[PDB]
Design a protein around this nucleic acid. Structure first.
Lengths: 102, 75, 102
RNA sequence: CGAGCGCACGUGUUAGGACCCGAAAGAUGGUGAACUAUGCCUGGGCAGGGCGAAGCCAGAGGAAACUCUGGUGGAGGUCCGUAGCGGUCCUGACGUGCAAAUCGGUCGUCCGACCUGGGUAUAGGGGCGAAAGACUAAUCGAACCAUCUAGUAGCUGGUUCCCUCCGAAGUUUCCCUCAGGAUAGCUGGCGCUCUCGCAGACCCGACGCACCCCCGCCACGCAGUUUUAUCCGGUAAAGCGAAUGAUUAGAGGUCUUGGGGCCGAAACGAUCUCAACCUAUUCUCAAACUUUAAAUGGGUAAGAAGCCCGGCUCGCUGGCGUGAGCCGGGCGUGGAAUGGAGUGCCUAGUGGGCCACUUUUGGUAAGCAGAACUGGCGCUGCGGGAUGAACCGAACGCCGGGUUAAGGCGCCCGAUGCCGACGCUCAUCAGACCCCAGAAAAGGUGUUGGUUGAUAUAGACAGCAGGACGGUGGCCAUGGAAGUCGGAAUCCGCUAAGGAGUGUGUAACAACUCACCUGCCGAAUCAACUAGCCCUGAAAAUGGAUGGCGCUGGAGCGUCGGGCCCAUAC
RNA sequence: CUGGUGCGGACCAGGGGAAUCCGACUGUUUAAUUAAAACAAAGCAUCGCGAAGGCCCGCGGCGGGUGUUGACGCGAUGUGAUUUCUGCCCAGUGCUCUGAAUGUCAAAGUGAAGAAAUUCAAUGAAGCGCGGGUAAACGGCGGGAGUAACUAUGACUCUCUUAAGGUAGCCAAAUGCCUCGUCAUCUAAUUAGUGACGCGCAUGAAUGGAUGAACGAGAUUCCCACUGUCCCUACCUACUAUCCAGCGAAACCACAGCCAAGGGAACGGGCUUGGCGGAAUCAGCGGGGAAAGAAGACCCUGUUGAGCUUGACUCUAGUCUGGCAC
RNA sequence: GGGGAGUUUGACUGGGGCGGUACACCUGUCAAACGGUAACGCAGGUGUCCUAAGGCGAGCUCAGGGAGGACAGAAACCUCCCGUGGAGCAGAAGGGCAAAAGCUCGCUUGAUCUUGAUUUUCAGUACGAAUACAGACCGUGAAAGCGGGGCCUCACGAUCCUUCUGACCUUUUGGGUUUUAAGCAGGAGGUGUCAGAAAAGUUACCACAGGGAUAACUGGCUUGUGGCGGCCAAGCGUUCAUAGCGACGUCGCUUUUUGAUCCUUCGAUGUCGGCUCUUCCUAUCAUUGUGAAGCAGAAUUCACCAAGCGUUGGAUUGUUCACCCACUAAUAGGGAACGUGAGCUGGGUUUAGACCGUCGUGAGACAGGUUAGUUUUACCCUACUGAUGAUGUGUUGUUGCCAUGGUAAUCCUGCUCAGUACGAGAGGAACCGCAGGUUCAGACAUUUGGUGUAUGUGCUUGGCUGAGGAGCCAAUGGGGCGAAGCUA
RNA sequence: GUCUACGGCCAUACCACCCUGAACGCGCCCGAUCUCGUCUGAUCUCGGAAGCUAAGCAGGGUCGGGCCUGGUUAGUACUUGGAUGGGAGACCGCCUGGGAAUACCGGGUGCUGUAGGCUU
């Protein structure tokens, strides 16, 4: 306070960004291409500084890429289950389930 | 009153101005701190080495002759 | 009480957690990070819209709350009530101190 | 198998000052009551007037008790007021004065605790005080003089001839230590022990030097360095579907409870369910977490003090052996680049630092506080950044010639007075060079560049031939609405259109344009972004600052080419 | 009766009233900034003392003052005219008294052991400690509750807790932070005054409470009368200043003295870039010279002092008591 | 036994013995992969505790979870299975441990006596603590071995003096004996300021040495707090995001607030407020010119160019600040060393005198009230307003030219316009016209007023010249009226 | 091939589950008088040798987990050294050198000294 042992005490709580972070991801129907960026550009005016906006090259919040994702799902290596899709390698001990029905 | 605390940086050049860097090595050194039992025993060996010369040199005159002859006798 | 984020913008410290050693931190104003139809299956929404930060800085939880609300109101306006899934993907864990002066 | 006496020097110490100059104080012995403080003895001094006490004499009332009324009388720490004594207010005058405290006015007292001369007493830790620590000889919260005495100081001030040579510290530890010493370090001086390059008239190194060649010769040794080996750590980075700790989210499934249930009865029952609890995943983290895990870093070794042999001694260890020691013998030096090394004694100054690239803690940040490395300023000047402690270049004896670094070349000002090359920009606050002294978020159909998406002679785009309703009140809301807004709705037809209407329009509700191609004259149009100059965003107190003048085919901004200019550097 | 309504005609000579605070008044003080609300003061109240004494000086004695004295007298204090009051607390700190009711304790001197130096035991004055009295001695004064009626407050009472818990009075005052407390007056307006209100931070009874006529070179507020204080400044006189004749210092002085901006030890006369500069001077002037006056009295450091205090640490005169000797 | 004396009354420290030990210690981190490392940096612990919680040897495995079992339940006790330290190791945290270093027993004192060496902190001094050996006596275990305190990192101490134990020790002064004393070794009694002094205040009566190495002002850096804006646009504005505002967010500016810091002066810069005077800034209260409005007019609100000219008279406090009456076009905000003391002022703050309340036993303290309290020097240089003058034109005069520097006027009221415009009405303006005024400036004396020592006149008091006259002195005697002159 | 005792490396050796068994080799297994110790001959200890390889143990199987070792992650993240390189800043590009770790995709699943057997 009078600097005779000055050291602050907790107040507020922030998050640290990194060049290339992803502060907000919106998912919707492809028809809403110009609603997504239109709305999301507002957040550029609430956050400090400049933040490039961007349209993902992925199906959703998945690890995956352009819509060959769904081809892979047809191949059954990707299982639609929950807000994301569960990956499946060809490892594992179900070499009788993959027989009975893959 | 108030004083300002230290700052410690020039004491790195201070040494190397002309500071030595090796412990001044030497050949066989002072047996200070060896296992004292070994110390006693080895000392007995030394005392009966610089005694027992009618032991040592009278049983090494043989090896003197032997090497002093063989080192040529290879020829 | 203002303390505008001008002071606490730049990243300038060793990252605090909410720890065993820093106690009583005020709760981050933003608490719930998913808005909109967040039960949707993956096959529904094939478009993910991102937002990358182009500056190395700190973002305040208060700011995150304002941004999330401001970006949700518009996109409710356009897409509807079950048309999106806004997911803040950043979390305020780094606390900051304030040295009260007499 | 040894060294005292005298002399010169250097340091530290004690002192007749101990480099010189300085305290506030302390002690011993004395001199003062001519100022004032207070007692005593002795003398002197206080115009004029206002009030009317006690007594006193007489006159009236009355029942007496007694009471009135008039003159007399002249008491008082009484009253107005002069000398005297003081000294309130002008915060008046002068304030290097008439004066080390006076003057002008206006002020309190002026018969009492009054004012005053001379004599006499009380003396310094003592007197004296109607008490303010006042007075005690222009001095008093302990006088004056002399001596001890030059008291003492870690504290300021200064500390006197020339050149030459070498050259710091502001850090460790301890200290009633923090403005100081001691100690280490850094410094100079005196030297030493060897190298052996006067190294002939002879004659080599897997050991250097000389080379006649080193009989006389150690190339021995060292490193703020890289190289080759082998070691050490746990920061940066990275991870959570790897433990600890924090945390979002969905799912897939049973279980433990709960909401209300139901069954009808408890059922978390089939319906649930909601949580929980799992099981696979999922979004984001850690200076006091970690599986992993660098760069730069720290040690050792890179051969004669070595290697291979042979024989003794050992009171130790004990199958026999071990290991340690000794004596004798043979083989020479081993990776690059530099260079003479090793060793002793005495010892002044310093122990207030500061700044910068990079890393880093406290803070909002600070020309702030605190750390590591390295370099500077300090201790240092020169060219350049106008100006300056540190920035850039750069290291100095005295000069002549040439050449550069950082810089710069309209003029100040030496240098472009070159054919300089390609571009960007108009600023009624332009812009103009590291530290560095003008600022942002957000905007611009100012002007360029660029990315992407749409359409084009089969005319695409603006301005023309259309087209802006014919069925139609068509559904059929009657909250009235071929459009109806606020009517749930919902068709034709014509390649032209008009959806069963764009809303203005409250006359039900009419009128208006809305949307989509070929033919009107005729070539490219439009949309969404991004980043370059310039602009808005943009407020200071004396008149001012790219250094100034100024400079817009640049003397401005970006990338560039020659040619020139100079420092104490080369 | 008389004068231009002038007649204490120069001179000499009191402005006035309604209130508040303090002190009774007269008196006295800080010579050289403090004239007062400070001291004194009568009045009140204490405390010791019957001279082989109280108090006090002293280096010393049949020393010395009060003492040419004797309780209506000395010596030591507190308050401070009169009126009228002085409440409660003796656990605390001191004072004093008692002593049997005596735990603690020094010299001597007495016993026991040892050859002795010693050692041990008992013994036991003052003084503490034990118990009374003492407040005009130093000083000290509280908290939650229930509870009448709408009730709060709270009459009446529960108690920890101290030794007692602010009694009579009195106030936003010379004492009240919040504070410009709240009402009313006083003015157009009043943080001032006055008058009331008081669980009053922190009022209060001879650390005196409260009143009160006179008085005060004492602090305030208000009203009448006067007015160069002011609106709004003029004009007049003497002495300076001014100039001449004569006579003639000191303060101070690194060099000298034009500004902006810049850098700089962050406020330059000097340096950089600018703006520019003219001999020698007189009367004024208060902006600058961070002007002069002084080795800053504020603050910090000092292993530097003094004045003063006390429950500091060591001590000391004096004084009480025991022993030894005359 | 403060009557009297001597003396002391720690250090650190974002100025100051206020707070707190960063004053000895130990862990984790900062700490930048040697390993050293700083702050009153962060999270913490100690001045102990243990006959076992030591030393050996043997035997068992802990945490929790799952299924079962009479009372028995969420949890007693028994059993089976899973069980990588998830538990326990005296205490802080870190490390370490699973036939142990834990748990249970069994036996025991190696927690003992005695030299030297080394580590740890560093001068490579000691104390503390620890390392590895050696010589004795032992312990346990069959034994190999392990043990000389705690599983490791903290848990404690010099000289002098006292005290205790040790050998048939040395000395006790010419010799002998015996008491006692001194010696030599090892432990203890303690120095927490922890390398180790024995120690209470107050100075507003103060003093000397110094310090800007260190506070109280302005000046600088910063701008958190203070003030001014800007951006985004959910909403308020019946309808409507932007006429006027603006939340949740966020970017700046200004130095008219208050902080933070110590750079400049302690051999001195005079430090509050008020009065007087100049000038400056603009983020404009009024006025000139303009746009906008949820603007009919009238008022009023937002914004633009803009500091040329205005921004008051008073009650209360010292007041800056505030508050209230009144007028006004308006009663905007500020800088200039918080402008300005050799300009004043001295009200307050801030010496020495006093009073009350709280605190202290007391001297005394109060950022609690109250009262009285010396404001010093100009002629130096510069600046500024005035005044002589200087080169040039051969000397000298008359008459002018004008580079240049100064700047000046502002605002209001009434009549007309016009009860018209404008409006359901309530209400109600504007232009040129006319009339005047408030502030400022430059003058001036005809009149009006003030001055008056023309000593101009009279009227007078006291005294003086012997009186009538005619005067004079009373620091200008007083008092009527007053010319020229200066003036509002 | 393979086992037994002592081991060194101490997961390519662990865990889970299923299959296989080249002496009496280990072991299960039958008893408790001797030795010994427990509440329980369960354990420990002793004495045995009827059956057993059901178990341990060894070997094998597992689109097994785990573990070791490779790739992709990537010359990305990161950093020694340089500049009068950009940016108002936050940061960033370049010159010069060094150079990682997840996710993901491969491969492997004990070796071996010593003394001693057997080929069921």
């Amino acid at each position: 306070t009078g600097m005779r042992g000055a050291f602050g005490k907790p107040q507020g709580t922030v998050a640290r960004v990194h060049i290339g972070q992803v502060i907000m991801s919106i998912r919707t129907k492809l028809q809403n291409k110009e609603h997504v960026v239109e709305a999301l550009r507002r957040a550029k005016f609430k956050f400090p500084g400049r933040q490039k906006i961007h349209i993902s090259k992925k199906w959703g919040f998945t690890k995956f890429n352009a819509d060959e994702f769904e081809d892979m799902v047809a191949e059954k290596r990707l299982i639609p289950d929950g807000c994301g899709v569960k990956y499946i390698p060809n490892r594992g001990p179900l070499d009788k389930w993959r027989a009975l029905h893959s | 009153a108030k004083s300002k605390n230290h700052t410690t940086h020039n004491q790195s050049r201070k040494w190397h101005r002309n500071g030595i860097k090796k412990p001044r090595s030497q050949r066989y050194e002072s047996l200070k701190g060896v296992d004292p039992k070994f110390l006693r025993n080895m000392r007995f060996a030394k005392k009966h080495n610089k005694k027992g010369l009618k032991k040592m040199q009278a049983n090494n005159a043989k090896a003197m002759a032997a090497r002093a002859e063989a080192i040529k006798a290879l020829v | 009480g203002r303390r505008p984020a001008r002071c606490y913008r730049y990243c300038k410290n060793k990252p605090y957690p909410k720890s065993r050693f820093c106690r009583g931190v005020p709760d981050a104003k933003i608490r719930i990070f998913d808005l909109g139809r967040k039960k949707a299956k993956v096959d529904e929404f094939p478009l993910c819209g991102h937002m990358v930060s182009d500056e190395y800085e700190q973002l305040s939880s208060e700011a995150l709350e304002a941004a999330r609300i401001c970006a949700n109101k518009y996109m409710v306006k356009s897409c509807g009530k079950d048309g999106f899934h806004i997911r803040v993907r950043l979390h305020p864990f780094h606390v900051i101190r304030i040295n009260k002066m007499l």
